[PDB]
């Protein structure tokens, strides 16, 4: 619970940890109490100037939840302390963010820009199809996956969750953006074997 002493810790509310990071960088993180137990904590991490996601933690290996767990569990994986879950979860998450953002499949940086880039890329190519990944603003910690058959077509979107273990979509995690592209291909083939 709120007994953390780490330099990334803040007793701030979820809105306060947000508005704190909204004054920080395109990559930010602060530890704060969880809304679902004393054996639980959270990390609020920032993706863009006004975009953030909460990631709960469980303080495992303690006889009482009033006591600080000898381990910290994140997305179902244990670690020795908050500084381990932060370096592991953040640095792995941030490198996956560099490989996705550097990907040719990744669109622009903010809603307006990506909607302008997908529509512009669709209308300048009104007979070619369009499919790109970008930040999701209604569902942080997930990236949106916009698809159009062409300029004259409707628009469809799906999502991929970001995790320090990779990218998670439909039902499985891919430890790198390249494997996410393989996941998408093996999944569309499993979908084409139905359509």
């Amino acid at each position: 619970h709120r007994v953390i002493n780490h330099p990334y810790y803040f007793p701030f509310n979820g809105k306060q940890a947000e508005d704190y990071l909204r004054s920080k960088e395109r990559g930010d993180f602060v530890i704060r109490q969880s809304s679902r137990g004393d054996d639980h904590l959270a990390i609020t991490w920032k993706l863009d100037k006004d975009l953030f996601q909460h990631v709960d933690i469980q303080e495992l290996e303690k006889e009482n939840p009033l006591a600080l767990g000898k381990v910290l569990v994140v997305e179902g994986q244990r670690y020795h302390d908050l500084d381990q879950i932060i370096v592991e979860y953040l640095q792995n998450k941030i490198r996956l963010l560099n490989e996705l953002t550097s990907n040719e499949k990744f669109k622009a940086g903010t809603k307006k820009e990506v909607v302008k880039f997908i529509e512009d890329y669709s209308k300048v190519n009104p007979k070619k199809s369009v499919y790109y990944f970008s930040l999701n603003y209604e569902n942080p910690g997930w990236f949106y996956l916009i698809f159009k058959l062409n300029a004259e077509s409707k628009l469809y979107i799906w999502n991929v969750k970001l995790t320090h273990t990779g990218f998670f979509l439909v039902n499985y995690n891919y430890p790198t953006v390249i494997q996410l592209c393989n996941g998408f291909k093996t999944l569309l083939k499993s979908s084409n074997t139905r359509n």
């Binding site: 439909v170 569309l188 084409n192 359509n195």
Partner: peptide
């Protein structure tokens, strides 16, 4: 929002 998974498949709409 922030706690609401949703994602349909790639939808290849073709023999891909």
């Amino acid at each position: 929002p922030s706690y609401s998974p949703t994602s349909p498949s790639y939808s290849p709409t073709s023999p891909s």
